[PDB]
Write a protein that holds these residues in place. Structure first.
Motif, PDB file in Angstrom:
ATOM      1  N   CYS A  75       0.835  -1.177   0.000  1.00  0.00           N
ATOM      2  CA  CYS A  75       0.000   0.000   0.000  1.00  0.00           C
ATOM      3  C   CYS A  75       0.878   1.237   0.000  1.00  0.00           C
ATOM      4  O   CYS A  75       1.855   1.322   0.744  1.00  0.00           O
ATOM      5  N   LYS A  76       0.583   2.148  -0.901  1.00  0.00           N
ATOM      6  CA  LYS A  76       1.189   3.465  -0.932  1.00  0.00           C
ATOM      7  C   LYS A  76       0.132   4.473  -0.541  1.00  0.00           C
ATOM      8  O   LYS A  76      -0.973   4.428  -1.084  1.00  0.00           O
ATOM      9  N   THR A  77       0.430   5.368   0.399  1.00  0.00           N
ATOM     10  CA  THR A  77      -0.521   6.415   0.780  1.00  0.00           C
ATOM     11  C   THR A  77      -0.090   7.728   0.184  1.00  0.00           C
ATOM     12  O   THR A  77       1.107   8.000   0.062  1.00  0.00           O
ATOM     13  N   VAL A  78      -1.064   8.563  -0.154  1.00  0.00           N
ATOM     14  CA  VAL A  78      -0.815   9.881  -0.717  1.00  0.00           C
ATOM     15  C   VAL A  78      -1.654  10.894   0.032  1.00  0.00           C
ATOM     16  O   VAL A  78      -2.900  10.833   0.052  1.00  0.00           O
ATOM     17  N   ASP A  79      -0.948  11.859   0.646  1.00  0.00           N
ATOM     18  CA  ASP A  79      -1.521  13.007   1.323  1.00  0.00           C
ATOM     19  C   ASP A  79      -1.961  14.029   0.273  1.00  0.00           C
ATOM     20  O   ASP A  79      -1.141  14.569  -0.485  1.00  0.00           O
ATOM     21  N   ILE A  80      -3.260  14.294   0.209  1.00  0.00           N
ATOM     22  CA  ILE A  80      -3.739  15.278  -0.768  1.00  0.00           C
ATOM     23  C   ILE A  80      -3.863  16.688  -0.239  1.00  0.00           C
ATOM     24  O   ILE A  80      -4.233  17.601  -0.987  1.00  0.00           O
ATOM     25  N   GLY A  81      -3.513  16.881   1.034  1.00  0.00           N
ATOM     26  CA  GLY A  81      -3.724  18.192   1.691  1.00  0.00           C
ATOM     27  C   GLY A  81      -5.123  18.297   2.305  1.00  0.00           C
ATOM     28  O   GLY A  81      -5.689  17.279   2.760  1.00  0.00           O
TER      29      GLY A  81
END
Length: 292
Positions: free
Chosen positions: A259-265
């Motif tokens: 799993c890769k997580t991405v912070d979108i703000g």
């Protein structure tokens, strides 16, 4: 952020009813299937699809009773959505797919993946449905609201008779202010109050505080599957989020395989409306390594 919907309509007849879908991009690879939730449609994906279409087919259905799809007089239980989406997927001839899913589209996507694991090559998800075991685990700001939705009297008054899911919940769960043009795109399927049935049934199906039991069991089953599956996963999250707060996203980065997580703000629930370009560009960048 774009407000237009520059996608030609496509239709398939499934289970006696027409479903509308976006279909763009090349036909000779693994398509990316985008699944919206409540109270949205393929319009939610309008600014995300253009990042992916250059490299992959994009298919984005409007769930039965929603968007430009037909609006039969159903109860619109989750099980109805399952039947219609299963039939949709076969009617457009999809074999292997990459899923991009949100809210009830994530319950549909994870349930389909659990049942068809060999056909799912990746899952991008955001603000997805998992069990909410007690009301204390539902966001405080939304507790009163959803408790009232989950009634046969007040909930129908608010959602069907007064359009609270479109006029209230939707804009309240985007950080930036939705424009009137965007709101009119979201309003269009539900101009006739009687057609708002799915918008009320959906919050009544959410797996909160053990109810309804069939949904809790189904969602527990797909989450057990997801926790043990090696399928590549891409999880977008925002601050403060709604269903998946920052600390829960961080926990999922550790507790979901590959799993890769991405912070979108900044983001609440409809993350696609706050940062579509990062969501689209990150999905596009992540697709090539899934091929082999």
């Amino acid at each position: 952020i774009g407000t237009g919907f520059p996608f030609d309509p496509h239709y398939v007849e499934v289970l006696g009813e027409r479903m509308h879908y976006v279909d763009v991009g090349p036909r000779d690879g693994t398509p990316v299937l985008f699944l919206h939730g409540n109270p949205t449609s393929s319009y939610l994906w309008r600014n995300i699809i253009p990042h992916v279409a250059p490299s992959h087919r994009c298919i984005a259905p409007d769930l039965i009773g929603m968007g430009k799809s037909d609006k039969p007089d159903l109860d619109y239980f989750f099980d109805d959505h399952v039947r219609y989406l299963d039939a949709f997927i076969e009617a457009v001839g999809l074999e292997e797919v990459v899923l991009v899913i949100h809210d009830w589209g994530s319950a549909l996507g994870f349930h389909w993946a659990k049942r068809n694991p060999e056909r799912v090559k990746g899952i991008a998800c955001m603000e997805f449905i998992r069990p909410i075991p007690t009301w204390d685990e539902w966001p405080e700001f939304a507790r009163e609201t959803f408790q009232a939705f989950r009634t046969a009297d007040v909930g129908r008054e608010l959602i069907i008779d007064q359009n609270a899911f479109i006029e209230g919940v939707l804009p309240k769960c985007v950080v930036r202010p939705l424009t009137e043009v965007e709101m009119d795109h979201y309003r269009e399927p539900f101009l006739k109050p009687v057609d708002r049935e799915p918008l009320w049934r959906f919050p009544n199906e959410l797996p909160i505080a053990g109810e309804p039991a069939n949904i809790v069991a189904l969602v527990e089953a797909y989450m057990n599957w997801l926790h043990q599956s090696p399928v590549p996963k891409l999880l977008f999250w925002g601050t403060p989020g709604v269903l998946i707060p920052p600390a829960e996203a961080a926990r999922l980065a550790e507790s979901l395989p590959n799993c890769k997580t991405v912070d979108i703000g900044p983001g609440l629930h409809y993350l696609q409306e706050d940062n579509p370009d990062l969501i689209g560009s990150e999905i596009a960048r992540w697709l090539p390594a899934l091929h082999h």
